[PDB]
Design a protein around this nucleic acid. Sequence first.
RNA 1: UGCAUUAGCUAGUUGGUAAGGUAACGGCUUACCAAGGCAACGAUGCAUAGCCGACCUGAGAGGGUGAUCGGCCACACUGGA
RNA 2: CGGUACCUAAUCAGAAAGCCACGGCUAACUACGUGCCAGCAGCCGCGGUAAUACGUAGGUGGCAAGCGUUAUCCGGAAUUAUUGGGCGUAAAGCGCGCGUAGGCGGUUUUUUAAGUCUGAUGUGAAAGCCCACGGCUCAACCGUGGAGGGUCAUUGGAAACU
Lengths: 131, 89, 198, 156, 80, 135
Amino acid sequence: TMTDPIADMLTRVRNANMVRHEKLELPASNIKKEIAEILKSEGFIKNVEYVEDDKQGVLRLFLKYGQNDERVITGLKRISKPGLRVYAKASEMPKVLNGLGIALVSTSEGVITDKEARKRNVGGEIIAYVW
Amino acid sequence: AVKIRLTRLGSKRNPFYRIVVADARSPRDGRIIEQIGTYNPTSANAPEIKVDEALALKWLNDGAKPTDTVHNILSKEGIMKKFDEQKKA
Amino acid sequence: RFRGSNWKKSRRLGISLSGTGKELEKRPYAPGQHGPNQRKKLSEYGLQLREKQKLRYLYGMTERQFRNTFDIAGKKFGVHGENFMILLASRLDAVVYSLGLARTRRQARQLVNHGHILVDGKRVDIPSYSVKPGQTISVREKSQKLNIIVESVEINNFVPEYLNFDADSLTGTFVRLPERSELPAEINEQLIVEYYSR
Amino acid sequence: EFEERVVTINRVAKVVKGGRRFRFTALVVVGDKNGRVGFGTGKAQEVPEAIKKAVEAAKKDLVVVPRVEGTTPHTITGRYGSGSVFMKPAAPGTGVIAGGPVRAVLELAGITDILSKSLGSNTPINMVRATIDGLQNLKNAEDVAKLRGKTVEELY
Amino acid sequence: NDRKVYVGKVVSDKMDKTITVLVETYKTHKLYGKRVKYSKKYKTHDENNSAKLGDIVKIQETRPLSATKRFRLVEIVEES
Amino acid sequence: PTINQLVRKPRQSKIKKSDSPALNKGFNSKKKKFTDLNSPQKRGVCTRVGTMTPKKPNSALRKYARVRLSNNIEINAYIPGIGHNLQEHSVVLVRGGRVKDLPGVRYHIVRGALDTSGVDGRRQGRSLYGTKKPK
RNA sequence: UGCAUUAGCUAGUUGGUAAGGUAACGGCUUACCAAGGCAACGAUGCAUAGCCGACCUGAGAGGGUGAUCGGCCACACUGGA
RNA sequence: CGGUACCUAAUCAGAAAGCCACGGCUAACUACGUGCCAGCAGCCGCGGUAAUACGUAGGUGGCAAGCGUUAUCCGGAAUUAUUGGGCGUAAAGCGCGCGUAGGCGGUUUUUUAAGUCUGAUGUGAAAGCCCACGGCUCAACCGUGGAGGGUCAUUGGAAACU
């Protein structure tokens, strides 16, 4: 009876990011795998990997860090929810950490990102201010 | 009827009329039909007549009348002098 | 405005540019009654107030004349602490003091209000009129000489940057507006901008 | 030059069966105008040692604040305990507008183009902690692109 | 020209040729931005008892044929 | 909360009960009702004039007066200044302004305005207490 | 605008059926038919208040004033014709 | 309106600033009474015979025809917390339920383009409101030029997510 898929999936990442993990996964969909692709399209992790099982197979994460035993993923938060579906305008779209994060864009142009919608001139359903 | 008038502006003892063609049933600064141009005759030399005479061809042909002071700057500046051939249709 | 005699004013405030100097006669610590004592400072909020006091009392106006220029310094999107000064340097108050038309500014800022200075043509009675640079800052031909008019032209030459002058009835040009480097360090102009922030 | 800024003088009275003490503690902030900022305190009595042991205490830890120059590079905040600060980058020609514990680490690093919505508490200990604990969590653009494994100029 | 041609779906056909369709849509709190469903029935005149139960009736406004009869019938799709 | 139930019940703001309830009230003299028009000073007439002890350990006797306003509300109003013309039935003017460390009395008495003149022997507080500026 | 310390509201009412009559419409009234229609999404009622532009201060999210100054509504000792 | 405004000359350096503190907040202090009295009093508070705090008087100070008081809306203040609040002991769980309505709901495919987000225009109000001039002796105070709506309508669409 969970309601936000893309948030509990996102906080499970931060659930093991705190204790310095290098390997986790998540279930799949039409979206959530391709959502996990846009993470490794920018390449914030080593590689997000293949979906295997019967229904919503585990697709890996492989958390990629810095050489000072650090972490790269500071801040992990979906902004929309069942009850509040939020949208963005392309003309006043901001920059996460003033140019040090990313903000993805979801519409029927394909689920795009901050660079992939600032020069696309569409907004959409924004999700993550991840820096 | 509907008629051209002298609707003023400006600070104390100094008017700035922008002309208005509208009904006589309204007050002199009331709600209008069309603010055509301005007319500031109170200068040292000029009357400062700015006029867009394109719409006098409409209203004077189906109901608007020039009235006794807005009539004769049109006969002075030549607004109705162009209308003199435009009424000659 | 101010309407004083600046002989104690060089000792009272930070500085107020009376003449060559007036502090060396008596003890220059304070004018009196409590000065050479437990010397107390005030806050940086009061220092910018004191840095305001070194320029409000210097330029001699009131507030909302030194203060209403500050919002038009928010219209000019340069450095707010100094673009405020360049519009403050662009008026008729620089004329009655700096180019010598008296032994001070008070006898010459009288002389504009009589209609005996007559800049830019016929008459500008007021010194709050910004000298829009390019207008011929002239002198009335019916008041050419006094004990004060042509005297301190010989004393103080170098009518300042982007304001030229002459002896052709002592007329200037005010060719452009001077920058913050043509604004003296007798009072630091940067420390007025935050008292007006508060 | 480890730039000094004092906060307060103090007196603490430990009421006992006998007599209360006259300890004069303090706390200071010590920056350098380079992005290498510390802060220190001490249970002292001497107003010099209120600076000196605390300047020594601030030189136990100067935190590394990455500064993309001209301002603070992002619209950031702070966090410690019951207090929290906030910073929005702005124009240079403003005049710095902030407070006691929120201006302190912000003025001893030479940035001068920032905001201050000092939320949270009024106790300056956790306030200037939140002024520091927020500021130490700052990151630049070049190291994170190295950390993420992109290039630096790819981020705009 | 035309007149307004809004849609609906019946709730209660009153006795002798008065059907009552239901319109509902989603308005927001502008302080919050969160939209919320809300309803507004606009009662149509049925000319010949055309509409039925379940019918997603598209209607068209008129001038009042009676006290409530502001809308007249164009389109009826199904029935339960 | 939820933004769902915030639609169901909005964030209604908090009221603020304002000080001096006798100065934001008029009187419909024709219909025995009350208006609310927030005067600076509503005039009145004295009924009793006395003094009062501060219950806080500061010790004095500060002079007060039982005044009835235009809208006939009886107050206890502090009479500032030293000497007065407030024996009884003086048709006076009354400000707000609470005197602390004195229970109940929270109104001043405007010196030198309505039927009193102000006090005489003041030379540092001259604009107040009814004293015209000397020479 | 607010009150459920206002919940059950209406009975030419509620739909239709015929006459009017209006610049036109019909429960608008009149003879007919069923109790219907209206409702806790708070109908009903109470209390309060001309409305809007506009003012104003707020980072924005905005919301408080109307002497202003404009646009619309209502009134002219009261109550009817 | 009005010979008012304005211009000429003559004129004397002519005839004009007031007010609250001088305690810590907050820059402006000292003596006489004074003896918790008179009285001040924004919070902390001063006066019990050595008051800088009262009251008496010189300095200054804040800034000018105002200064001070009174009352009234807003910021300060994220004490209504969508933005941006808590419910163990501080104020926030009935004594527990069960349950009617309501709200909100697991997972994975395909249709619409409704909601989303864009693109062609019309396009949003007069003093109020973007930017730059013109009129005012400055200015107070009135116009100009697009900006113009970038919000609403007339219009084309796109399906991950509803």
